Design an enzyme around this catalytic site. Structure first.
Site, short mmCIF file in Angstrom:
data_model
loop_
_atom_site.label_atom_id
_atom_site.label_comp_id
_atom_site.label_asym_id
_atom_site.label_seq_id
_atom_site.Cartn_x
_atom_site.Cartn_y
_atom_site.Cartn_z
N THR A 1 33.32 37.43 -2.79
CA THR A 1 33.75 37.71 -4.15
C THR A 1 33.23 39.04 -4.68
O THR A 1 33.45 39.35 -5.86
CB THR A 1 33.32 36.58 -5.10
OG1 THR A 1 31.92 36.32 -4.93
CG2 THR A 1 34.11 35.31 -4.81
N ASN B 1 27.81 28.23 8.79
CA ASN B 1 26.41 28.44 9.16
C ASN B 1 26.00 27.57 10.34
O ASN B 1 25.22 28.01 11.19
CB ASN B 1 25.51 28.19 7.96
CG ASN B 1 25.66 29.26 6.90
OD1 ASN B 1 26.11 30.37 7.18
ND2 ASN B 1 25.28 28.94 5.66
N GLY C 1 23.42 42.16 -2.60
CA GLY C 1 22.48 43.16 -3.10
C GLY C 1 21.09 42.99 -2.52
O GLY C 1 20.39 43.98 -2.29
N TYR D 1 30.56 27.36 3.57
CA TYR D 1 29.38 28.03 4.11
C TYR D 1 28.64 27.13 5.08
O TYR D 1 28.08 27.60 6.08
CB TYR D 1 28.46 28.48 2.98
CG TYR D 1 28.88 29.80 2.35
CD1 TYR D 1 29.41 30.82 3.13
CD2 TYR D 1 28.74 30.01 0.98
CE1 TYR D 1 29.79 32.02 2.56
CE2 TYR D 1 29.13 31.21 0.41
CZ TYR D 1 29.65 32.21 1.21
OH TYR D 1 30.03 33.41 0.65
N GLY E 1 17.96 37.04 1.18
CA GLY E 1 19.19 36.83 0.44
C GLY E 1 19.79 35.46 0.71
O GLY E 1 19.30 34.68 1.53
N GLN E 2 20.88 35.17 -0.01
CA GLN E 2 21.54 33.88 0.15
C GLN E 2 21.98 33.66 1.59
O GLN E 2 21.68 32.62 2.19
CB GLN E 2 22.72 33.77 -0.81
CG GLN E 2 23.62 32.57 -0.51
CD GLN E 2 24.66 32.32 -1.57
OE1 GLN E 2 24.38 32.37 -2.77
NE2 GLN E 2 25.89 32.05 -1.14
N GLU F 1 12.73 42.77 25.78
CA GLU F 1 13.74 42.68 26.83
C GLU F 1 15.16 42.77 26.28
O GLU F 1 16.08 43.10 27.04
CB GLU F 1 13.55 41.38 27.62
CG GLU F 1 14.17 41.40 29.01
CD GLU F 1 13.65 40.29 29.90
OE1 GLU F 1 12.65 39.63 29.51
OE2 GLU F 1 14.23 40.07 30.98
N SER G 1 22.69 39.41 5.02
CA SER G 1 24.09 39.81 4.90
C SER G 1 24.18 41.31 4.64
O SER G 1 23.21 41.96 4.22
CB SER G 1 24.79 39.03 3.79
OG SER G 1 24.14 39.21 2.53
N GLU H 1 16.46 35.55 -6.30
CA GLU H 1 16.85 34.48 -7.20
C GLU H 1 16.52 33.16 -6.52
O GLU H 1 16.60 33.05 -5.29
CB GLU H 1 18.35 34.55 -7.53
CG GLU H 1 18.91 33.30 -8.15
CD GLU H 1 20.04 32.71 -7.34
OE1 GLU H 1 20.39 33.28 -6.29
OE2 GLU H 1 20.58 31.66 -7.76
N1 LIG Z 1 28.20 33.25 6.98
C1 LIG Z 1 27.67 33.18 5.77
N2 LIG Z 1 27.87 34.22 4.88
C2 LIG Z 1 27.34 34.16 3.64
C3 LIG Z 1 26.59 33.06 3.24
N3 LIG Z 1 26.19 33.27 1.96
C4 LIG Z 1 26.67 34.46 1.55
N4 LIG Z 1 27.39 35.02 2.58
C5 LIG Z 1 28.08 36.32 2.57
O1 LIG Z 1 27.19 37.28 2.05
C6 LIG Z 1 27.87 38.17 1.19
C7 LIG Z 1 27.23 38.12 -0.19
O2 LIG Z 1 25.85 38.38 -0.07
P1 LIG Z 1 24.72 37.30 -0.44
O3 LIG Z 1 23.84 36.98 0.75
O4 LIG Z 1 25.34 36.05 -1.01
O5 LIG Z 1 23.92 38.09 -1.60
P2 LIG Z 1 22.32 38.26 -1.64
O6 LIG Z 1 21.77 38.72 -0.30
O7 LIG Z 1 21.72 36.93 -2.04
O8 LIG Z 1 22.02 39.40 -2.74
P3 LIG Z 1 22.22 39.20 -4.33
O9 LIG Z 1 23.28 40.16 -4.82
O10 LIG Z 1 20.91 39.51 -5.02
O11 LIG Z 1 22.63 37.78 -4.61
C8 LIG Z 1 29.32 37.74 1.14
O12 LIG Z 1 30.04 38.54 2.05
C9 LIG Z 1 29.28 36.32 1.65
O13 LIG Z 1 30.47 36.01 2.34
C10 LIG Z 1 26.38 32.02 4.13
O14 LIG Z 1 25.71 31.04 3.79
N5 LIG Z 1 26.92 32.09 5.40
MG LIG Z 2 21.89 36.01 -4.04
#
Ligand SMILES: Nc1nc2c(ncn2[C@@H]2O[C@H](COP(=O)(O)OP(=O)(O)OP(=O)(O)O)[C@@H](O)[C@H]2O)c(=O)[nH]1
Ligand SMILES: [Mg+2]
Ligand SMILES: Nc1ncnc2c1ncn2[C@@H]1O[C@H](COP(=O)(O)OP(=O)(O)CP(=O)(O)O)[C@@H](O)[C@H]1O
Ligand SMILES: Nc1nc2c(ncn2[C@@H]2O[C@H](COP(=O)(O)OP(=O)(O)O)[C@@H](O)[C@H]2O)c(=O)[nH]1
Ligand SMILES: CC(C)C(=O)N1CCN(C(C)C)CC1
Ligand SMILES: [Ca+2]
Ligand SMILES: [Ca+2]
Ligand SMILES: [Ca+2]
Ligand SMILES: [Mg+2]
Ligand SMILES: [Mg+2]
EC number: 3.6.5.-
Lengths: 54, 438, 349, 425
Positions: free
Chosen positions: B179, B228, B144, B224, B10-11, B254, B140, B71
């Site tokens: 969001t 990060n 999703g 972000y 994921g992102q 461990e 995360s 994506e």
């Molecule tokens: N700390 C941190 N949190 C992140 C970052 N990117 C997204 N998030 C958190 O992750 C959550 C959203 O999930 P994403 O990881 O963006 O979504 P995804 O895993 O790509 O899944 P999709 O719905 O398919 O896009 C939100 O609560 C964001 O605040 C990041 O780069 N750093």
């Molecule tokens: Mg995503």
């Protein structure tokens, strides 16, 4: 307040201090979950297309 | 030497993974082109850093990492970024459309169509390992993909690598940088199906990272990138023992042994200090006692909660920089006589301490200041159950009306899985209360 | 415009605080389950502290200190006093107490009997009292332990002050209730007005069976006492009358003879648990009103009986105190668009 | 490459659709001939969401213009940006629809729909990954209302898993063309409740009142109304057309806005709305106050008459993102009685550095409020007033429709109202 297992090397050292002593789903079953959900999606889409054809 | 494979989903997982491997390279003296001048064994070797980097005949040091996203826009940054040369294309996997913050869409709909491919790529990395330890999975809770596809991947990993450990680095949802309204749903759905498959999970609450950036780094509205780079410092502290010569937390096994006596209760609280702004005129360097005492301040925890009202089951102090065992014990003694530190009776009241002489590395131009010494404390407190309570509460508010449930059912998930997952979290919350409360 | 929620409908105190808050026109009350609040008037039991301080943009404040139960639970207070070096087992202002668990469930049975046998041997007054959070007064250890086994909850046995200070005319017992407000900065404010809850029956040391002249509770006096409201209205004497009495009878003042010891006890207790319950560096803030109950013996020595975490107030003092709670506890964090009624007990944080 | 296929149907649909492509083409630096002449890469970052790229670096909108009479689409073609549209994407008939839902949906429309779907198919076949469709139309006429919902039904059949989105202009007696508009609107809402994921409800009375009361236009025209819809359409699609994380996906926007499938009718809002004191700088607090003011909303439903299920707010321009979060948190915390408490954190804010043409900064409001039920109540009352006497029904029964079809649409719309009312309590 005892130190134990003191290990030292060139890049660092570690140890342990004690202040007080004490007192799955198979491959098959996963495929079924996935294929079951896919089937429920297929049934929902067939009901839509059946509704639209009517 | 035993290899570790990192998986970023994921992102959130991908971008955090990008900041970690950037930091790993600066720590081990690896350049963006993969070359490592200090590595005198060309084309191979079983050094401590080789647990995270393989080597080619051309001397390139390649991370043992897989990046996965449904994506492509986030992973496309890696393919053209500064460290584009570190990874080969097989390691960067992307789909065409994401899970839309929908656990069911990432787990069932899209996961089913891409799971076998991901395993095939992971299998390729495993084939290069002579003694694979296990996996570190970054993701995360709210996304999703991070929620839905990770839980599927963890299930298959237990099937294809039964004897391998799996640690998690999970991003707990925070509304200030979120969001998605349905992240409580996703968080609890993914914790339910993953719980039995994770041996040790480090939850990072974005709310905590956010306020540390505003309070200590003077970032009015953190990004972000700011979050990060700070997260990767904590991650580096936790994984340093696997990448450097040492005797504490030397293998993934461990971590469970030193931090998780009870399997379900495998969420250690992380605390880090000091976080100093690089824009400061110039800082008075903190001592071993001052940075250690800070590890018991809620303001420095990865998850805001009150350990004073929980019970400890384990505690590791990971120091980096100018630290000798003498000053550590002197600070611990002073903290015992002033702090509320209650252990469970069936566990010893002690601290496992690791010291790495190399002080923390900082990304040039980043936000953190260079400090002479720092520490990350890993403590298994029942107080971290406060985070489960908050999350479960938001779940209950929405699920009582069945709000947004049609999106999940529409992807082939059964509504019963909602209450099934919620009942599991109710059990998890009860385990914490049995262990911490009297 | 600030916002607050009410989660204890049975609190006579904060019901008045909520009333005053609305009377300012700058506070709005929300449903009890609405999370977007500045102030929570929380419930007594299982207050969800773990959900406080996680609302972006809202500075949240609650009217209970998490962990104060250590001070306001009969069994906890005893354990806190014996185990805390600040209070020590040799603490002079707290009666010799022991934690006794019923045999149907550590426990201080043998430790209690050792001190008991010592008193019985040295001809000393050996009258103890058993109570829990249903009271028994007896001079025989056999009756105190048997009475606890018949129950099923934790009990405490502490020495019974056989030489209480008796007011005249009447030859009657009493106790003092001090209201103490600790704010978010952990300042300890003692309400200038206390109340003596007096017994309208003459004290009788040769009959602990009739507990009407031994227990000065407002409910027991107004139900099982036949002289209720004879000497003072509602068996409640306030500091003004009590002080004049101490001057006429004993040629001393309430401040010198009793108040100094009270302020010392309040300070010692609250400063002790400050590291455990302080919200100085926490994501939310806490304050709390406490009800300290003291005893006074015939030597003008002050003993701490208990500490109430959700106390009530004297009918004549609700207005002043509740208004004082808004000034120093609520408006100190949420200001609005004297001669303080409190006494600040200065201490080292 | 998450392409969206745009469709505009009927007179209202095409005139508003025209202004929409005119507004966003400017924002993306596309001139009337499809050539790019911007100065920022943010313009082309997500340009392929609404534009195809032809030879010579030309950008052609991915839009399909549909009508049953040639008139309006002749104006578009002769209009400012008429050359920018793909000539083959003009699909039109000659009979017209006579402001008759039955003609657009059953008789006249049914004769032309297959050729429209042939153009929709050709556009989708080029999409690397089609997100879904957006339709601009009115509900008070015949083509946009009747044939529009026919096209939606047929698009659902061929693309059942793609997002279907619409901008729907609701009729009002104050800005009416014929007395049968309530009939056409109730019949369309029946379709919309079932076949769209998101519908932006645009009430011509709100647009009128805004032009008269707030903009001080003595005699508002359709062109004046359309300027507001253009600005609103550009605002609510900013999340899609520029790099962002809030609602960058049509499906993600629906997941965060639609807690129940049938309640997907939004109130759009925009700020500022200044009358020609137009050069004054607008502060973030002012942007927020106005964006939440009923007078700045285009569904003609007082939000204080209901509760927000979800809210999406997009801020455009260089501004204090810190000050944005504060002001947004101030609106919620100061009026939390109008936000349902069983959906935590149901207000999401997005920021975009690129402001609209001629504005230092602006804010667009997207609300899923139960107050929208007042809009369907008005239409329902106007409908019943005529239907109880069967007035003007012969126009519809003459096209093969039965009265039963009217009764079912009415019953479904009243059910929709009852659902808004139950979640409002
Ligand atoms: N700390 C941190 N949190 C992140 C970052 N990117 C997204 N998030 C958190 O992750 C959550 C959203 O999930 P994403 O990881 O963006 O979504 P995804 O895993 O790509 O899944 P999709 O719905 O398919 O896009 C939100 O609560 C964001 O605040 C990041 O780069 N750093
Ligand atoms: Mg995503
Ligand atoms: N050790 C002791 N010696 C003498 N009297 C005692 C005593 N312990 C308690 N009492 C009597 O008991 C009364 C208070 O009882 P206690 O406070 O323990 O019960 P309680 O908490 O239910 C009433 P409250 O909370 O209102 O003070 C006092 O009036 C006091 O006279
Ligand atoms: N906002 C706006 N509304 C319009 C416009 N043209 C027509 N309408 C409204 O749409 C309804 C008439 O439908 P129309 O589009 O003309 O019928 P169609 O051509 O068959 O789709 C009436 O309620 C009009 O008020 C326009 O240009 N702008
Ligand atoms: C997963 C599910 C079938 C889906 O794809 N949806 C829901 C239905 N919606 C139409 C109503 C336009 C299209 C999008
Ligand atoms: Ca090597
Ligand atoms: Ca396992
Ligand atoms: Ca014909
Ligand atoms: Mg009591
Ligand atoms: Mg017309």
């Amino acid at each position: 307040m005892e130190v134990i297992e003191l290990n030292k090397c060139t890049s660092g050292q570690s140890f342990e201090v004690i202040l007080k002593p004490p007192s799955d789903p198979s491959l098959e079953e996963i495929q079924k979950k996935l294929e079951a959900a896919e089937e429920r999606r297929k049934y929902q889409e067939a009901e839509l297309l059946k509704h639209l054809a009517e | 030497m035993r290899e570790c494979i990192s998986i970023h989903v994921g992102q959130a997982g991908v971008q955090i993974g990008n900041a970690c491997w950037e930091l790993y390279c600066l720590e081990h003296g690896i350049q963006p082109d993969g070359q490592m001048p200090s590595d005198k064994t060309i084309g191979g070797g079983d050094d401590s850093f080789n647990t995270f980097f393989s080597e080619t005949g051309a001397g390139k040091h390649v991370p043992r990492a897989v990046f996965v996203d449904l994506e492509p826009t986030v992973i496309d940054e890696v393919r053209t970024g500064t460290y584009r040369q570190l990874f080969h294309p097989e390691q960067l996997i992307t789909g065409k459309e994401d899970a839309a913050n929908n656990y069911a869409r990432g787990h069932y709909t899209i996961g089913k169509e891409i799971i076998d491919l991901v395993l095939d790529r992971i299998r390729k990395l495993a084939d290069q390992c002579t003694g694979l330890q296990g996996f570190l999975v970054f993701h995360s809770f709210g996304g999703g993909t991070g929620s839905g596809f990770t839980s599927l991947l963890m299930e298959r990993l237990s099937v294809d690598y039964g004897k391998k450990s799996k640690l998690e680095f999970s991003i707990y949802p925070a509304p200030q940088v979120s969001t998605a309204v349905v992240e409580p749903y996703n968080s609890i759905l993914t914790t339910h199906t993953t719980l039995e498959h994770s041996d040790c999970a480090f939850m990072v609450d974005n709310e905590a990272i956010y306020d540390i950036c505003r309070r200590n780094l003077d970032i009015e509205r953190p990004t972000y990138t700011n979050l990060n780079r700070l997260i990767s410092q904590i991650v580096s502290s936790i994984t340093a023992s696997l990448r450097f010569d040492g005797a504490l937390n030397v293998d993934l096994t461990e971590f469970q042994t030193n931090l998780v006596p009870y399997p379900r209760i495998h969420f250690p609280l992380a605390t880090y200090a000091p976080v100093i702004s690089a824009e400061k005129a110039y800082h008075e360097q903190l001592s071993v006692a001052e940075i250690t005492n800070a590890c018991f301040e809620p303001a420095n925890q990865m998850v805001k909660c009150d350990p004073r009202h929980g019970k400890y089951m384990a505690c590791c102090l990971l120091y980096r920089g100018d630290v000798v065992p003498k000053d550590v014990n002197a600070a611990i003694a002073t903290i015992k006589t002033k702090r509320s530190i209650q252990f469970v009776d069936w566990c010893p009241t002690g601290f496992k301490v690791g010291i790495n002489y190399q002080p923390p590395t900082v990304v040039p131009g980043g936000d953190l200041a260079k400090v002479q010494r720092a520490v990350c404390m890993l403590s298994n407190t029942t107080a971290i159950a406060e985070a489960w309570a908050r999350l479960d509460h938001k779940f209950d508010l929405m699920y009582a009306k069945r709000a947004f449930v049609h999106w999940y059912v529409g992807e082939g998930m059964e509504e019963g899985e909602f209450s099934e997952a919620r009942e599991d979290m109710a059990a998890l919350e009860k385990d914490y209360e049995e262990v911490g409360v009297d | 415009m600030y916002t607050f929620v009410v989660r204890d409908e049975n609190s006579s105190v904060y019901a008045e605080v909520s009333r005053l808050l609305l009377a300012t026109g700058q506070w709005k009350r929300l449903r009890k389950d609405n999370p977007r609040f500045n102030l929570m008037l929380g419930e007594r039991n299982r207050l969800p502290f773990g959900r406080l301080g996680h609302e972006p943009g809202l500075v949240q404040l609650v009217n209970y200190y998490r962990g104060a139960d250590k001070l306001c639970r009969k069994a906890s207070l005893v354990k806190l006093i014996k185990t805390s070096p600040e209070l020590s087992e040799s603490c002079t202002w707290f009666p010799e107490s022991y934690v006794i668990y019923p045999t149907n469930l550590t426990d201080e049975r043998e430790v209690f009997l050792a001190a008991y046998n010592r008193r019985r041997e040295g001809r000393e007054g050996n009258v103890w009292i058993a109570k829990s959070s249903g009271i028994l007064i007896s001079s025989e250890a056999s009756e105190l332990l048997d009475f606890i086994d018949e129950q099923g909850q934790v009990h405490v046995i502490q020495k019974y002050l056989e030489k209480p200070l008796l007011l005249e005319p009447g030859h009657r017992k009493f106790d003092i209730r001090s209201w103490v407000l600790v704010d978010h900065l952990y300042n300890i404010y003692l309400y200038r007005e206390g109340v003596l809850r007096t017994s309208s029956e003459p004290y009788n040391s040769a009959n602990f069976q009739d507990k009407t002249c031994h227990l000065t509770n407002h409910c027991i006096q107004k139900e099982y006492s036949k002289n209720y409201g004879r000497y003072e209205e509602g068996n409640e004497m306030f500091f003004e009358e009590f002080n004049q009495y101490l001057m006429d009878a004993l040629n001393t003042t309430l401040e010198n003879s009793i108040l100094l010891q009270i302020k010392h006890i309040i300070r010692s207790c609250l400063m002790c648990i400050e590291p455990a319950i302080s919200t100085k560096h926490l994501h939310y803030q806490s304050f709390q009103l406490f009800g300290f109950d003291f005893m006074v013996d015939e030597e003008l020595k002050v003993w701490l009986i208990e500490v109430n975490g959700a106390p009530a107030c004297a009918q004549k003092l609700y207005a002043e105190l509740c208004q004082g709670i808004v000034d120093v506890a609520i408006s100190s964090v949420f200001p609005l668009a004297p001669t303080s009624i409190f006494i600040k007990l200065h201490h080292h944080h | 490459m998450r392409e969206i296929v745009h469709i505009q149907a009927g007179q209202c649909g095409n005139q508003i659709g025209a202004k929409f492509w005119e507004v966003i083409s400017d924002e993306h630096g596309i001139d009337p001939t499809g050539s790019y002449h911007g100065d920022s890469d943010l313009q082309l970052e997500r340009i392929n969401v609404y534009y195809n790229e032809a030879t010579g670096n030309k950008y052609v909108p991915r839009a399909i213009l549909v009508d049953l009479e040639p008139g309006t689409m002749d104006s578009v073609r002769s209009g400012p940006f008429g050359q920018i549209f793909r000539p083959d994407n003009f699909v039109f008939g000659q009979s017209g629809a006579g402001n008759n839902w039955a003609k657009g949906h059953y008789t006249e429309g049914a004769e032309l729909v297959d050729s429209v779907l042939d153009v929709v198919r050709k556009e989708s076949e080029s999409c690397d990954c089609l997100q879904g469709f957006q339709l601009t139309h009115s509900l008070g006429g015949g083509t946009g209302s009747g044939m529009g919902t026919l096209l939606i039904s047929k698009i659902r059949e061929e693309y059942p898993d793609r997002i279907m989105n619409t901008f729907s202009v609701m009729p009002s007696p104050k800005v009416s063309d014929t007395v049968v508009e309530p009939y056409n609107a109730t019949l369309s809402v029946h379709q919309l409740v079932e076949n769209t994921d998101e519908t932006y409800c645009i009430d011509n009375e709100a647009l009128y009142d805004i032009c008269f009361r707030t903009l001080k236009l003595t005699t508002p025209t359709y062109g004046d109304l359309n300027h507001l819809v253009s600005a609103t359409m550009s605002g609510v699609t900013t999340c899609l057309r520029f790099p962002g994380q809030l609602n960058a996906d049509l499906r993600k926007l629906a997941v965060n806005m639609v807690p129940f499938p049938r309640l997907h009718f939004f109130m759009p809002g925009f700020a500022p709305l200044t009358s020609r004191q137009q050069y004054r700088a607008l502060t973030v607090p002012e942007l927020t106050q106005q964006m939440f003011d009923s007078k700045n909303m285009m569904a003609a439903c007082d939000p204080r008459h209901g509760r927000y299920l979800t809210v999406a707010a997009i801020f455009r321009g260089r501004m204090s993102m810190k000050e944005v979060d504060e002001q947004m948190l101030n609106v919620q915390n100061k009026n939390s009685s109008y936000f349902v408490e069983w959906i935590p954190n149901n207000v999401k804010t997005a920021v975009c550095d690129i402001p609209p043409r001629g504005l230092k900064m602006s804010a667009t409001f997207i609300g899923n409020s139960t107050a929208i039920q007042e809009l369907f109540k008005r239409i329902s009352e106007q409908f019943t007033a005529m239907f109880r006497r069967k007035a003007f029904l012969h126009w519809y029964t003459g096209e093969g429709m039965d009265e039963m079809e009217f009764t079912e649409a009415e019953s479904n719309m009243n059910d929709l109202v009852s659902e808004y009312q139950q979640y409002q309590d």
